[PDB]
Design a protein around this ligand. Structure first.
Ligand SMILES: Nc1nc(=O)c2nc(C(=O)OC[C@H]3O[C@@H](n4cnc5c(N)ncnc54)[C@H](O)[C@@H]3O)cnc2[nH]1
Ligand SMILES: Nc1nc(=O)c2nc(C(=O)OC[C@H]3O[C@@H](n4cnc5c(N)ncnc54)[C@H](O)[C@@H]3O)cnc2[nH]1
Ligand code: MET
Ligand code: MET
Ligand code: SF4
Ligand code: SF4
Lengths: 241, 241
């Protein structure tokens, strides 16, 4: 029943996706069924921080959020890792809704949980070929079908990270497969380890413009948002922000 | 019945507000009832480009959009200037909807038009004391009341530009006055004339972080998005992008 927690920080801003810029708290869980080659939070699954895992109850996480956040937040983003691996997260999501706190979720869309229907901002991020991951579309279909059946279409978005042209073609395939779902494109980060912020920012902004220029002429990507990682532009690869 | 046009460009991305990152075309009109001290598009009203005004029909604007944009767009953003000054814009907004094109609008919220109800993404931007403008709240109440009566609440947002603490207090007043409306905070641009992009980007990112740090501890700004100007981070103060 305990929840494996690695990070609890905030208040900060959501740097990605459907609710980008939103002031929110963060709860990063441990464990991933994926092993993406460019995972910017590899410590959640690579075993390098397994000893740092704190198994907490829903009340303990909420108390710690209220502690470091005070009354200066009404939004909480649950990430990882793949939080969808944890069924016991239901007690925490319910506790948030019972305290007038809106919840967001970051998942790659492999495992479905019934507490998905309680998420106000559900971001599903299928992984492109550059992540060396293989996408199970049957599992992705089941998740999106279940969400649409519970009228959660206003709370669900698709976000694909792009590193090259191959990823962009993969993103088009996903977008065409699910026409009604709000679609997002995200700039891929090359160096998730570098400490030189100035070079990183200039590099990512260059990648952003190159992506924008490419999508601009693609007629199959008209209903698409193109966004970077704002928190990376502000603090680089720093954790806890 | 002619529409005063100064800019027609795209496809690019929406760099601000509720639909930030969205691939869209731009139609910037002429004329403003405001004279904000930090207007990043002063040429639309300061009279410096009055000779460049092209009075076009709805069909001519649409034909030019289809010309430079092709079939690589499904979204059009109408800005200025204050487009709400133009009643004859109705024919153009209708023409967009009749051609499966979603329309967005940028206005400061002074003048109301009946074609507001046809806008898919209506951004209202009340001006803070730093703009040297005085906000008529009675006019702002009428606009927001009319929109809520036609169930356009899903299509309307409030966005306040912040330059200092005084603007931030003004933003809180606006947010408190309209609790149900999605609220946005935007980083103010100091130098809208500078040509040194690298210094401008580093300066605006610093202003962004300072704004985020300030909002993070404010309990009255929980349901708030904090965003910069993405197009300024990509192309600086360049026009036509
Ligand atoms: N302020 C703030 N602080 C954070 O810590 C924070 N974290 C996240 C977050 O972890 O979301 C997960 C998404 O990140 C993607 N992702 C992984 N690796 C990536 C990479 N190398 N390049 C580009 N994208 C990558 C992944 O697809 C997933 O959808 C989001 N917003 C945040 N905002
Ligand atoms: N790609 C792309 N190209 C554009 O040309 C473009 N234009 C606009 C746009 O004009 O929106 C108007 C908003 O801009 C605000 N605004 C004025 N002056 C400002 C300033 N000095 N600093 C900070 N904000 C300012 C104003 O409040 C208004 O709400 C929006 N997105 C765009 N995206
Ligand atoms: C570091 S990614 C965390 C969320 C989830 N694993 C995803 O990829 O969407
Ligand atoms: C250059 S701003 C253009 C849109 C409108 N005048 C506003 O301030 O919101
Ligand atoms: S699914 Fe997300 S957390 Fe897991 S390895 Fe991929 S990017 Fe990292
Ligand atoms: S209302 Fe908008 S266009 Fe008019 S002066 Fe102010 S910022 Fe410029």
């Amino acid at each position: 029943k305990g929840i494996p927690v690695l990070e609890i920080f905030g208040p900060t801003i959501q740097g990605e996706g459907m609710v980008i810029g939103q002031k929110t708290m963060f709860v990063r869980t441990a464990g991933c069924d994926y092993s993406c080659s460019w995972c910017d939070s590899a410590f959640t699954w690579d075993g390098s921080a397994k000893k740092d895992i704190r198994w907490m109850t829903a009340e303990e996480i909420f108390a710690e959020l209220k502690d470091i956040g005070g009354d200066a937040f009404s939004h909480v983003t649950i990430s990882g890792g793949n939080p969808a691996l944890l069924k016991q997260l239901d007690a925490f999501i319910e506790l948030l809704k019972e305290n007038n706190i809106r919840a967001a979720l970051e998942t790659q869309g492999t495992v479905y949980q019934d507490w998905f229907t309680l998420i106000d901002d559900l971001t599903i991020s299928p992984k492109p070929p550059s992540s060396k991951m293989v996408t199970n579309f049957q599992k992705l279909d089941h998740i999106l079908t279940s969400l649409q059946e519970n009228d959660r279409q206003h709370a669900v978005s698709l976000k694909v990270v792009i590193f090259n042209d191959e990823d962009l073609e993969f993103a088009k395939t996903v977008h065409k497969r699910y026409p009604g779902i709000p679609f997002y494109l995200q700039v891929g980060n090359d160096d998730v380890h570098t400490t030189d912020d100035q070079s990183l920012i200039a590099h990512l902004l260059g990648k952003y413009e190159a992506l924008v220029d490419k999508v601009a002429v693609d007629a199959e990507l008209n209903l698409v948002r193109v966004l970077p990682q704002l928190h990376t532009l502000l603090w680089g690869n720093k954790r806890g922000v």
